[PDB]
Amino acid sequence: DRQQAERRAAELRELLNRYGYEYYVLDRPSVPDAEYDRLMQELIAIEEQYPELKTSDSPTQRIGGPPLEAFRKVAHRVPMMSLANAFGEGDLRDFDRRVRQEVGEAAYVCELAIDGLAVSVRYEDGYFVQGATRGDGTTGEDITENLKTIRSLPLRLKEPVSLEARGEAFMPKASFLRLNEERKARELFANPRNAAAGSLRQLDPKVAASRQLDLFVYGLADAEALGIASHSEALDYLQALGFKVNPERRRCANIDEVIAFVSEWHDKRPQLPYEIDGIVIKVDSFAQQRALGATAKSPRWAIAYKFPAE
């Protein structure tokens, strides 16, 4: 058994890891998940008698470990700048005009700005080693055990690389509704943003695990050191490794299409399973970014369109 335990937990780990990618990430259901579940129940039982084989990125970790009675501060690897806000066609034009004066027409990448909790996740050789909140931007809290419960985040990546990436953790609308009712059956959350930040900022891994959190990876700290030369190449790269990258992202040749994208989400937004706050726009090329630089506050190559005032 102890020699065979390892063998089978290792198979177990591989298969479960594989299969969680197709449910949680590609969304090839997560419905009749039987064998998945059968397979998870066997790993859990093997770790029950051989607690020493429960690997830090074993699928078991999504269940969640024991509470912590404290969280540690973490500064740990590259500042997390915040973005300038835009509120109308026009802040948008003005944001492009300083783009053009300095670099000529520049292609943009437009993304949906998710209303959630910003986090950083770090990996070493493919392994998830640490998770943290945005904090003030230079320091945040180690929320690693609660991040392991977000089933779409990978504990082990497709290739053994060492990197740090940034994503937004959120809770889907219907999950938020579900949630609150039971809270009413017994208190009550304001909205998903505070539900997710709430779920991630409490000390008990298992209550995180029960809130059905999700996350969308949106950037790569130090992408230049890894050889990436474009914002669109960063995400793609991130997608090739196994991360969940929001698929409504689109490359925009100029401000006009930028605004066409911005109008398209403004009214297609109610139909989303998650709550979007606006639209983040970035100059795609890392070279135009260098040229525009920053005001060590806010990149001149990025703006955050904040949607309106219902």
Curated annotation (Swiss-Prot):
Binding site for NAD(+): 33-37, 82-83, 111, 134, 168, 282, 306
First and last residue of the signal peptide: none
Protein name per the record: DNA ligase
Record-annotated active site: 113 (n6-amp-lysine intermediate)
Role noted for this protein: DNA ligase that catalyzes the formation of phosphodiester linkages between 5'-phosphoryl and 3'-hydroxyl groups in double-stranded DNA using NAD as a coenzyme and as the energy source for the reaction. It is essential for DNA replication and repair of damaged DNA.
Family the UniProt entry places it in: Belongs to the NAD-dependent DNA ligase family. LigA subfamily.
Cystines in this chain: none
Gene from which the chain derives: ligA
